[PDB]
Design a protein around this nucleic acid. Structure first.
Ligand SMILES: [Cl-]
Ligand SMILES: [Cl-]
Ligand SMILES: [Cl-]
Ligand SMILES: [Mg+2]
Ligand SMILES: [Mg+2]
Ligand SMILES: [Mg+2]
Ligand SMILES: [Mg+2]
Ligand SMILES: [Mg+2]
Ligand SMILES: [Mg+2]
Ligand SMILES: [Mg+2]
Ligand SMILES: [Mg+2]
Ligand SMILES: [Mg+2]
Ligand SMILES: [Mg+2]
Ligand SMILES: [Mg+2]
Ligand SMILES: [Mg+2]
Ligand SMILES: [Mg+2]
Ligand SMILES: [Mg+2]
Ligand SMILES: [Mg+2]
Ligand SMILES: [Mg+2]
Ligand SMILES: [Mg+2]
Ligand SMILES: [Mg+2]
Ligand SMILES: [Mg+2]
Ligand SMILES: [Mg+2]
Ligand SMILES: [Mg+2]
Ligand SMILES: [Mg+2]
Ligand SMILES: [Mg+2]
Ligand SMILES: [Mg+2]
Ligand SMILES: [Mg+2]
Ligand SMILES: [Mg+2]
Ligand SMILES: [Mg+2]
Lengths: 106, 61, 156, 197, 127
RNA sequence: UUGGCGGAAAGGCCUUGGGUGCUUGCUGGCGAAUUGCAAUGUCAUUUUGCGUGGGGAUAAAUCAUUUGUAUACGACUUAGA
RNA sequence: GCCCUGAAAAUGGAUGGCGCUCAAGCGUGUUACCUAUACUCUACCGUCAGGGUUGAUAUGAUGCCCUGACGAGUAGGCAGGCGUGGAGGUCAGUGACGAAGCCUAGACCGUAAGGUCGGGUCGAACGGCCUCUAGUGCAGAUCUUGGUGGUAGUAGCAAAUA
RNA sequence: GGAAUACUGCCAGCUGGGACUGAGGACUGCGACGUAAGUCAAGGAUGCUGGCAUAAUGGUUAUAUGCCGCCCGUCUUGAAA
RNA sequence: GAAAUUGUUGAAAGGGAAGGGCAUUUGAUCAGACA
């Protein structure tokens, strides 16, 4: 069909931070359709990928990926905390990420 | 934070070895170190400590 | 001498490992995984396909069939954490799956025996699929997330 | 959800809307605001006029071209409130402001698109009934905005065209509704009802 | 081909550079401790360079180990090369910088016979 | 392809006729494997350059000279087949 | 009680800013949530304390190992180390088949002082270890001597008729 | 008059999802389940499997982005002054 | 035949200084094990 999506759209908001100090080792993620910490429990442990493009082709591809995972909820509005193998770059604040349905408990 | 009651990292203040570099004196220390560890006799403990003393702390008899 | 030799050298002998207390025990799958349950594949070459769960193998893998005649998915192994268990089920009584095991999928074109036993297993499944309307069409299609669909609220 | 969200600014409180829009821009959503001249501010007209004149007297003493710039248009007034809620001196702040457009009236590119509202910022849902409020269109005119009449004339022309479009759309909807109702009461309709559709 | 070891961990790979060594040419990068009364570096204000301290010390198990798992031992001739004959799984020979080209050929041949790893075998090679 | 409408940044909207591809509205028959138990598994739009061939059109500005309605120097304002 | 009058200062202006009016204000009550080098658990470094272990046939009893606790710091004290000129001993050490020196967003070791290697340049001496010794470590002193910048193709090179 | 429920507390009641960690390295101890032999979640992780074997991971360096960072030395109760 | 300082060539960045710390993207470059 016209749709082939098997992931849930997400946004990279910022790093974990206080008023004046940030922590790049943890990123805050907003998941579309999630507005409650109870609903965000469903996505705990799910894999996250950030997909971007580069001019140089390395392994027979010009598309690169950074992998992560959902660890815990954040606040009262459905935001979650995510950690990545390599920390996401700060220029991606406001960029789209993909939340996959695996590992699954259904 | 800990509200310490005593000074931290304080040395015992007692000599645990001779200050001398005498090779034969160190052999006597090694001999009585072994005896004090495996004889539980108060005499050996006293002798071992006495071998660490300085000159003014070992007046002639 | 450019460098003074050390007085002491470390031992060249490797030490034995301490006895471990970690006994392997069988995996228990989640209750939704029952033979005959229709599964949705989340990753791999056949992502989005709807297959039929047949047997649980000894390497903690799930044996599935498309059937190959319906959607082109052959007899394969899948990981339990990479599938979705749906609420629809097809009866498996009348399907022989005893011959398929871990060794049958040894890595070491398509072999003749794989073609033959694919037809044998699919024939029983296809007869059961024809019992209910639209099931054959349902297994031919692919699963996809649409706009506004929330997986934490959808029931499969 | 939409790649571009167009907000009709009529009946929205300036500060409440600006706070909502600023957060959306920082989260990566492109926003277009139309009809900035119909924005509302809580408090009577005279009180808000005095506030702008307090802003007017602030300027660099030795060179007025260096001091704060006082923009009179309604779209620029809303832009000032929005820029104050964004770290606009950073590259991240600059990028967010580039995803925003503000217009007086509804320009031709967006007059045939769908407009939405922000309930958190709507005056009729926030202010206590009886409280005084001011309209941004008349406030801008009193402080030197020269294009109130031009926008009003263009808006009147647009509404005539939009009203004619709605008449055709309404008649088409009635025809579609009749066909669906007639197509009901059938076996296919009965099955859809059992499944909720 | 060395002894098995736990993964080597470096607590602080970044070099400790002297404060303001990037501001004045006369201030070298060799580490020096600031002793000024008002120094922000000495007082450890936020956003300033880190200072060496004993907490950064590496694990004693993997201390002095090269990434190949061996310890480096400088070698000047065949005689001191042969001191590593029984220790090929813990030490690796490195040829001194001032050994002539012809003598390096002799050392490399003996090391190959004894199975001793050489860390700089391409030095002064007339290839 | 026919016609109408749209100037606020219109660059879009509607309509007529025919040709052509598909149709899951319904019923059939073939094909898929081996990417080996997951690895974005590559399906979008930005700019620009080099070579093919199908059309289109065959200029100016500056320096130098000159002018004084101009002018510290630049600049400005005039003239010259 | 809240609000208002009483309530006048000089560059333009600050509940931190925007802005906010059944508040995003004031009084009060109930919950959820955010995050310090603090608290809890774990690993690693060091320090201190209490202990185990000489029995040859394998090298450090100042060795190896077990257990617990602790770690801010100017003036100042003490301890363990790094580097430099020269001296005794030793490695029957390195070297014109290239010693020393110098250059090197090249590699490795050490918490650090530093040490090691490769490449280039170069041409005659030099290093490791155990000890001895001192005219032994620089960013400053309107420090000493020498060298070199920005200023800058800048100020200017216009008295005495041509 | 007989119950229910709320509130507070207790269980050496059961069970699902997520994150971080794997220090040690023959045996020795305390226990559990067993008529027995033995087994075990009992003084610290093992089992199975895939891809790649090179700039892929990683290091160095330049740059970009988020947040943070006032000029050292000196006298001083107090120095970016 | 070092440094300050300078020319040429090559690379990179630059909206009222420059330089620094933590983290990662991109470019360039590089060692280690293939038992
Ligand atoms: Cl002129
Ligand atoms: Cl060191
Ligand atoms: Cl930055
Ligand atoms: Mg004006
Ligand atoms: Mg280092
Ligand atoms: Mg002070
Ligand atoms: Mg220090
Ligand atoms: Mg309150
Ligand atoms: Mg803490
Ligand atoms: Mg402490
Ligand atoms: Mg201290
Ligand atoms: Mg040389
Ligand atoms: Mg250099
Ligand atoms: Mg000579
Ligand atoms: Mg002196
Ligand atoms: Mg000096
Ligand atoms: Mg000084
Ligand atoms: Mg001076
Ligand atoms: Mg002059
Ligand atoms: Mg001049
Ligand atoms: Mg003059
Ligand atoms: Mg004259
Ligand atoms: Mg990398
Ligand atoms: Mg930065
Ligand atoms: Mg920034
Ligand atoms: Mg700051
Ligand atoms: Mg004073
Ligand atoms: Mg000061
Ligand atoms: Mg010369
Ligand atoms: Mg130079």
């Amino acid at each position: 069909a016209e749709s082939h999506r098997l992931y849930v759209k997400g946004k990279h908001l910022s790093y974990q931070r206080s008023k004046r100090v940030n922590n790049p080792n943890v990123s805050l993620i907003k998941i579309e359709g999630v507005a409650t910490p109870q609903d965000a429990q469903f996505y705990l442990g799910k894999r996250i990928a950030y997909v971007y493009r580069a001019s140089k082709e390395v392994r027979g591809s010009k598309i690169r990926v950074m992998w992560g995972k959902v660890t815990r909820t954040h606040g009262n509005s459905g935001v979650v905390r995510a950690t990545f193998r390599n920390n996401l770059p700060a220029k991606t604040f406001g960029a789209s990420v993909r939340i996959f349905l695996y590992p699954s408990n259904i | 934070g800990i509200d310490h009651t005593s000074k931290q990292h304080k040395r015992s203040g007692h000599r645990t070895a001779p200050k001398s570099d005498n090779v034969y004196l160190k052999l006597l220390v090694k001999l009585y170190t072994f005896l004090a560890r495996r004889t539980d006799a108060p005499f050996n403990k006293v002798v071992l400590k006495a071998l660490f003393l300085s000159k003014i702390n070992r007046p002639p008899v | 001498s450019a460098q003074k030799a050390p007085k002491w050298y470390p031992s060249e002998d490797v030490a034995a490992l301490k006895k471990t207390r970690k006994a392997a025990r069988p995996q228990k799958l989640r209750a939704s995984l029952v033979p005959g349950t229709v599964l949705i594949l989340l990753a791999g070459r056949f992502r989005g396909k709807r297959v039929v769960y047949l047997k649980h193998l000894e390497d903690n893998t799930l044996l599935i069939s498309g059937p190959f005649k319906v959607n082109g998915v052959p007899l394969r192994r899948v990981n339990a954490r990479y599938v979705i268990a749906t609420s629809t089920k097809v009866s498996v009584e009348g399907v022989n799956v005893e011959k398929f095991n871990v060794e049958y999928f040894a890595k070491e074109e398509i072999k003749a025996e794989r073609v033959e036993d694919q037809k044998v297993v699919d024939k029983a499944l296809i007869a059961e699929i024809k019992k209910t309307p639209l099931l054959k069409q349902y297994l031919s299609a692919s699963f996809s997330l649409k706009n506004g669909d929330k997986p934490h609220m959808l029931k499969f | 959800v939409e790649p571009v969200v167009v907000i009709d600014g009529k009946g929205h409180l300036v500060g409440r809307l600006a706070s909502v829009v600023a957060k959306q821009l920082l989260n990566g959503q492109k926003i277009v605001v139309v009809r900035a001249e119909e924005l509302n501010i809580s408090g009577e007209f005279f009180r808000n006029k005095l506030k702008y004149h307090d802003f007017l007297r602030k300027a660099t003493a030795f060179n007025k071209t260096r001091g704060p710039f006082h923009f009179r248009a309604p779209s620029r007034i809303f832009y000032k409130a929005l820029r104050g809620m964004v770290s606009h001196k950073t590259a991240r702040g600059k990028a967010a402001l580039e995803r925003l457009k503000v217009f007086e009236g509804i320009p031709p590119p967006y007059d045939k698109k769908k407009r939405v509202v922000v309930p958190q910022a709507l005056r009729v849902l926030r202010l206590k009934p009886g409280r005084k409020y001011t309209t941004l269109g008349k406030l801008s005119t009193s402080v030197g905005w020269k294009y109130e009449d031009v926008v009003a004339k263009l808006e009147a022309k647009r509404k005539v065209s939009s009203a004619e479009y709605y008449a055709k759309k309404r008649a088409f909807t009635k025809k579609v509704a009749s066909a669906n109702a007639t197509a009901a009461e059938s076996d296919v309709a009965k099955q859809l009802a059992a499944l909720g559709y | 081909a060395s002894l098995p070891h736990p993964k080597i961990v470096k607590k602080h790979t970044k070099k400790f550079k002297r404060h303001h060594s990037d501001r004045y040419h006369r201030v070298a990068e060799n580490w020096r401790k600031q002793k000024g009364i008002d120094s922000v570096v000495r007082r450890r204000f936020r956003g300033n360079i880190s200072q060496p301290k004993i907490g950064y010390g590496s694990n004693k198990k993997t201390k002095f180990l090269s990434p190949s798992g061996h310890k480096t031992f400088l070698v000047a001739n065949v005689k001191d090369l042969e001191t590593l004959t029984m220790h090929t799984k813990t030490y690796a020979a490195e040829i001194a910088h001032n050994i002539s080209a012809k003598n390096r050929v002799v050392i490399l041949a003996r090391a190959k016979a004894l199975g001793i790893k050489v860390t700089n075998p391409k030095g002064r090679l007339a290839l």
